[PDB]
Amino acid sequence: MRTLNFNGKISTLEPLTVTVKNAVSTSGHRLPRNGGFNAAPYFPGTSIRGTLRHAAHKVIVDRVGLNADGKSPFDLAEHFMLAQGVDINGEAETFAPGEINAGAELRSKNPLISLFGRWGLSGKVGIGNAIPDGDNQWGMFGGGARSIMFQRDESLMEFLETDQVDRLERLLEEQAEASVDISQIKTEQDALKKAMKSADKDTKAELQIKVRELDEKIQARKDQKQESRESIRRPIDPYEAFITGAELSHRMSIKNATDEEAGLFISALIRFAAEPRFGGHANHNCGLVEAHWTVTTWKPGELVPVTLGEIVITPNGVEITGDELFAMVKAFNENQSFDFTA
């Protein structure tokens, strides 16, 4: 068992963005911040870890074998336990505290669960956050605005029947009237939210009620729009993302990694390199990354770690250089004693 540290950089091919419920607020979309509003945003280790765990789950599904017409020989409980560590059945063998070698048999038979952990079983893999290199390297990408297709180019209107043209007329008049009414209501709402700043606690209750009621008024005003519930033409709030070519330092660790588990992890990185996507806004191709990792193992009691090799994920291929990385991959590919079932 070796402790492998993948220390390396994620270069950004297309902006790297993520919406975490914690970070974002009503002020707009913000990246998860390194402890403060005026801090360097980091790409969370949670998103990277989930992407790699799903890549490893697909690696396992491929490695066992797609039988039938592509259906994998795994139930839904197994897929959830392998990819998210949640047992829907509850039949997962909960290791009562104090159990010696907790899950050692499960770790030996399920290298994936050993790597990415479960409830009551520590995951050997720790996927750290990707911290950017240098000031800036983040920006408000996306954005823009929905425009009515038929108000932009008139040729598409030759493809619309008369009744559909009158439908568009009614839809736009409805959008305008709803916009004016909702905007007046929102002006009242933001004046009320300005009255928050005069924060007398006794008033705050009456203001939260008097603003959530005005937001229900907004919802009801939208609900009576026969043609379109939502205004079709509207500016898109931009999302904060790491710019293209941004260098994000990444640290990943596998504690006490067997050659089988480390080979599974390297195969997960290999399959991730096919679709090296991190985060969301994949409609704008956000998340495409090329990443290079230096694998260094550290024998405990030795003052220095030794370098096993380098994993380079690039659009031109995966360069896994190093005798020990290939040894790990071959050992994982050649071990037939993994039970991923219940």
Partner 1 sequence: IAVNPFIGMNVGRYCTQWRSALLTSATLSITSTPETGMEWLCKALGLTSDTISIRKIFSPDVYGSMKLTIAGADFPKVFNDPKEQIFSGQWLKAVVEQLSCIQGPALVLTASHYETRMIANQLGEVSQPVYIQKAGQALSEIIKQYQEKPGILISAGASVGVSPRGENGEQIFQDLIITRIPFLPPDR
Partner DNA sequence: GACCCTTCGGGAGGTGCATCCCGGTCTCGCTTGGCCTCC
Partner DNA sequence: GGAGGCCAAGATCTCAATTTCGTACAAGAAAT
Partner RNA sequence: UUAUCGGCGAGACCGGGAUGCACCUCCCGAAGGGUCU
For residue 109, what are the contacts with CB-CB under 8 A and spacing of at least 6? 337, 338, 339, 340
Q: Indicate which of a copy of itself, partner 1, RNA, none lies near residue 65 (CB less than 5 to 8 Å, by partner kind).
A: none
Place of tokens 């992890």: 265
Q: Indicate which of DNA, partner 1, a copy of itself, none lies near residue 200 (CB less than 5 to 8 Å, by partner kind).
A: partner 1
> Where is 36: in which H helix or E strand?
none
Question: Is the Cα dihedral 106, 4, 243, 28 positive or negative?
Answer: positive
The residue from 35, 235, 300, 301 that contacts DNA (CB under 7 A) is 235
Q: How far apart are CA 82 and CA 263, in angstroms?
A: 16
The residue from 198, 226, 283, 316 that contacts partner 1 (CB under 8 A) is 198
**Could you give the maximum distance between any two Cα atoms of the chain, in Å?**
82
Stretch of 9-17, 197-205, 224-232, 280-288 contacting partner 1, by CB under 8 A = 197-205
- Cβ closest to partner 1, residue 204 vs residue 233: 204
The amino acid that residue 199 corresponds to is: A
Segment 244 to 303, residues that bind a copy of itself, using CB under 8 A = 244-246, 251-253, 255, 267, 270-271, 273-275, 277, 282-286, 288, 296, 298-303
Q: How far apart are CA 14 and CA 45, in angstroms?
A: 18
Q: Indicate which of RNA, DNA, partner 1, none lies near residue 198 (CB less than 5 to 8 Å, by partner kind).
A: partner 1
Taking each helix axis from N to C end, the angle separating 45-64 and 259-274, rounded to the nearest 10 degrees, works out to 100
Q: How far apart are CA 306 and CA 308, in angstroms?
A: 6
* Least distance between partner 1 and beta carbon 39 (Å): 13
* Least distance between partner 1 and beta carbon 8 (Å): 25
Segment 166 to 205, residues that bind a copy of itself, using CB under 8 A = 167-169, 171-173, 176
254 and 4 Cβ atoms separated by less than 8 Å: yes
Taking each helix axis from N to C end, the angle separating 76-83 and 45-64, rounded to the nearest 10 degrees, works out to 140
Segment 11 to 30, residues that bind DNA, using CB under 7 A = 21, 27
- Cβ closest to partner 1, residue 136 vs residue 321: 136
**Residue numbers at the binding site for partner 1 (CB under 8 A):** 135, 197-200
**Residue numbers at the binding site for RNA (CB under 7 A):** 17-21, 24, 44, 46-47, 49-51, 53-54, 83-86, 94-95, 97, 116-123, 142, 144-147, 149, 152-153, 233-237, 278-284, 286
